[PDB]
């Protein structure tokens, strides 16, 4: 691609200065670019991308939302034209994060670490395609698949106090409760991750019990909200 | 719609 | 261009939709788009096409801000190369209003009201490019002969509270601070603007009295910097 | 850089 001729240290560097900058399409497509290359990715390199990622279709998703709500109260073409062509480009930066994770990030993650979280985002951007979908069972059923290997891997692999295994299970449990349609569910998930953390945290250095609790309060903030 | 609490950067 | 097969009515109509959406980049291209259909624009429209513009430009000097700093304290190519790639893309979007403005919403401005909006835009365009020149001095040039003329227009067309006339004298106040290196005229300017617009007040609507003194608040902001 | 206030949109 566009990003074929820089040198993956330069487009990791530019990633990292667009994050300064704010400006997230151009850290995501430095991060393509590093993808690219076919080298795996460092944790802090899977950081970088994941972020960039997040902050673009972010920002489409709640586009996305501002523009079918006015749809439905709505309910001319203009409202519907353009929420679609907005849906459409969220479906695209979905597509080709899901590209990267299958061609071939996935393939060559070994270590739990790695595979969990490309799984993890597997599950995160099958989810974005699933809010958007009116089909949507069988992305529906990819994002649970996802979800569900990495819980798999995270249980076994990794600490319950794990970033990455406790940011996993929040996801997994919105899934739940507002893409499954299982309100129950992701509240007993939430619980038992929150509770297993809690009697985990007694093994963590201060910088590391800092990492677990800051998402285990994200639990306990949808708790509050789903009791 | 009320959005809950997920992963990394609340960009949206 | 991309939107000339579009209605201008659809234009502006999903334009007002990007705003509420926050998606500025889209709201600029359709108001690019319904300035192109060759008809001259509304004061509402003047207002979304400035609003866009605005809100994009303001995105790539912010970022632009962030990189040359990094780019000085630093003083390899990656800092100054992505500086470079941000200030084209600025320039870029600044080279596009300009040629809106010259082809041809300012010859077509007759009244005072949409002729003083544009040239002030001008100003303003040409004080972006100066931020990032290192033809500097002709750049600063074409930003004072526009604000100047749209001074002179709004001095003796519009009343000293007329919104237009005092975000018109707040701008050209800031050129003459930072980037004509005449912070005495800046000074100057701003008091004088100030005080006559204060002594107008007397005449105006509360509606009106409201939209007059936010901008006069903006002047006072700057004075309380500047003394 | 510490900037001043210009008009409209504070976008940057
Ligand atoms: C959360 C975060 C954001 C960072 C940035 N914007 N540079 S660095 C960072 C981090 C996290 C864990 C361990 C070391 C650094
Ligand atoms: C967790 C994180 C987030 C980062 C960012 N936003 N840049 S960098 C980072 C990291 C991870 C491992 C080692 C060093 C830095
Ligand atoms: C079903 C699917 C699988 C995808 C992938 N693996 N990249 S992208 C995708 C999709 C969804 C909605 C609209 C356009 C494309
Ligand atoms: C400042 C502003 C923002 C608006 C919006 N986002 N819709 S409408 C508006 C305005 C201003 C003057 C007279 C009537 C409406
Ligand atoms: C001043 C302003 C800003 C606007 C916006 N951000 N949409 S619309 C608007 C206006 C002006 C004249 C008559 C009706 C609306
Ligand atoms: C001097 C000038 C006049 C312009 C116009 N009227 N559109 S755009 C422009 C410029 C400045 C810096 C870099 C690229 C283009
Ligand atoms: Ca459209
Ligand atoms: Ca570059």
């Known amino acids: 691609g566009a990003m074929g001729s820089m040198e993956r240290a330069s487009l990791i560097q530019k990633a990292k200065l667009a994050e300064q900058a704010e400006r997230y399409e151009d850290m995501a497509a430095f991060m393509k670019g590093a993808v690219e290359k076919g080298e795996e990715l460092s944790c802090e390199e899977r950081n970088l991308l994941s972020v960039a990622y997040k902050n673009v279709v972010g920002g489409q998703r709640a586009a996305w939302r501002v523009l079918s709500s006015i749809e439905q109260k709505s309910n001319g073409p203009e409202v519907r034209e353009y929420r679609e062509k907005v849906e459409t480009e969220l479906q695209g930066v979905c597509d080709t994060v899901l590209?990267?994770?299958?061609?071939?990030?996935?393939?060559?993650?070994?270590?739990?670490?790695?595979?969990?979280?490309?799984?993890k985002m597997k599950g995160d951007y099958y989810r974005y395609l699933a809010e958007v979908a009116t089909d949507k069972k069988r992305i529906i059923d990819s994002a649970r698949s996802a979800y569900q290997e990495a819980m798999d891997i995270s249980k076994k692999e990794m600490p319950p106090t794990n970033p990455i295994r406790l940011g996993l299970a929040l996801n997994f449990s919105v899934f739940h409760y507002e893409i499954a349609n299982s309100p129950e569910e992701a509240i007993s998930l939430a619980k038992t991750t929150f509770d297993e953390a809690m009697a985990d945290l007694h093994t963590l250095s201060e910088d590391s019990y800092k990492d677990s609790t800051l998402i285990m309060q994200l639990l306990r903030d949808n708790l509050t909200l789903w009791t | 719609k009320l959005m809950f609490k997920t992963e990394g950067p609340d960009s949206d």
Do not use: N, P, Q, T
């Not at chain 1, 590209?99 to 799984?119: C, N, P, Q, T």
């Open chain 1, 99 to 119: 590209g990267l994770l299958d061609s071939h990030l996935i393939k060559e993650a070994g270590d739990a670490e790695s595979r969990v979280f490309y799984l």
